[PDB]
């Protein structure tokens, strides 16, 4: 039977970028014709493999990571990038083999008055490793004095909301992102393209 790419792309709600979701896709037949034949994708970049060549390759496991960021942050979902998202929320490896897909979701994820459900980590001490997920809400210590879970001077909540409003410019509007990672591990393959 087929790979459940629809449960990820057509999901009614996406996760915050800091707590990004991962769908592990194994033991199914995948068709990458429909994905590239769509016209609703504003971003569709592949690294290390052509999007038409995927119907000829087999991989051990395919990972579909999904989350929401704002328009101007989509450029950070690529190998070799820096910034709040790439450093503190979702980091792609320098030798990333896969595709990055994104589309404007201002009709779904923004509310008049603000949709404060989507968050991103603003304060973090060092950078994420590739494919790391930090879901900590510990108060961030910005000085020598420890915070003991109490907010104040030099003691800040590490997550910040986007407050997506539909009247925002596209750079501040929400974008749903799906990242397809093709793990060419060394084990009996399970996901082929057809």
């Amino acid at each position: 039977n087929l790979c459940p790419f629809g449960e990820v792309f057509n999901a009614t709600r996406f996760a915050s970028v800091y707590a990004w979701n991962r769908k592990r896709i194994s033991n199914c037949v995948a068709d990458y014709s429909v994905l590239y034949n769509s016209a609703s994708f504003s971003t569709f970049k592949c690294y290390g493999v052509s999007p038409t060549k995927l119907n000829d390759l087999c991989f051990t496991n395919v990972y579909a990571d999904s989350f929401v960021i704002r328009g101007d942050e989509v450029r950070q979902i690529a190998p070799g990038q820096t910034g709040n998202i790439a450093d503190y929320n979702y980091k792609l490896p320098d030798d990333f083999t896969g595709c990055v897909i994104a589309w404007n979701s201002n009709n779904l994820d923004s509310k008049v008055g603000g949709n404060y459900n989507y968050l991103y980590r603003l304060f973090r001490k060092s950078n994420l490793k590739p494919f790391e997920r930090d879901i900590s809400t510990e108060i961030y210590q910005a000085g020598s004095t420890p915070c003991n879970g109490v907010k104040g001077f030099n003691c800040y909540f590490p997550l910040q909301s986007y407050g997506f409003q539909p009247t925002y410019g596209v750079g501040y509007q929400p974008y749903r992102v799906v990242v397809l990672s093709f793990e060419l591990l060394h084990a009996p393959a399970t996901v082929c393209g057809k």
Partner: antibody
Amino acid sequence: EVQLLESGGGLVQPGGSLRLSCAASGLTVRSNYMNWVRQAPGKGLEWVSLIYSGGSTFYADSVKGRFTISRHDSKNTLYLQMNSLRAEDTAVYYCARDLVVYGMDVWGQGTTVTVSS
Amino acid sequence: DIQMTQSPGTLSLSPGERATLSCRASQSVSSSSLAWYQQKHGQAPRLLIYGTSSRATGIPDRFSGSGSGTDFTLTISGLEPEDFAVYYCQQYGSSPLFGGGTKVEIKR
């Protein structure tokens, strides 16, 4: 007691180099977004350079390729290496701790850089 | 690119009057990314307001912020002699960006 004490400004000729220091107390440079903001005589504020606690650095187009922001965790000090200086780089330079959504709450007193032949 | 514009360049008021300082963005931005700064002559800037309307620590009640989208306002209720300075707004995209400034001077 929070304080950003800047030093290193002085007379430099165009094309020369100069390094500014920003000694902090009451906050950990290694743990913060830190900025350099300059103000030419008579004109407005201009953001120049930014460094993340995680180490990423970002620069204004007017200083890219010439300036380098950096720090020394032990000395709790922020630095700004300025190369290939130009007359338009003449300004008072401030360091500031940056909280992004919460603004730049702590500022230094400034240090003056004069670029002339 | 985004461009911030403050108006007027110079505001001429008497002590006790209400000052209204405008800051306009070239594209509609989140209210959390807009901050205000005061700079008195010969001094370093200080933070007045963050997140469009949140008053910073120690700032007097007479200062308040408002706006959204492309229009943002700094309001000073009951001007004080110490309040005649320059005021900069700042929009935070991927990096900070300051407006040109607005001078609040004494009317005569």
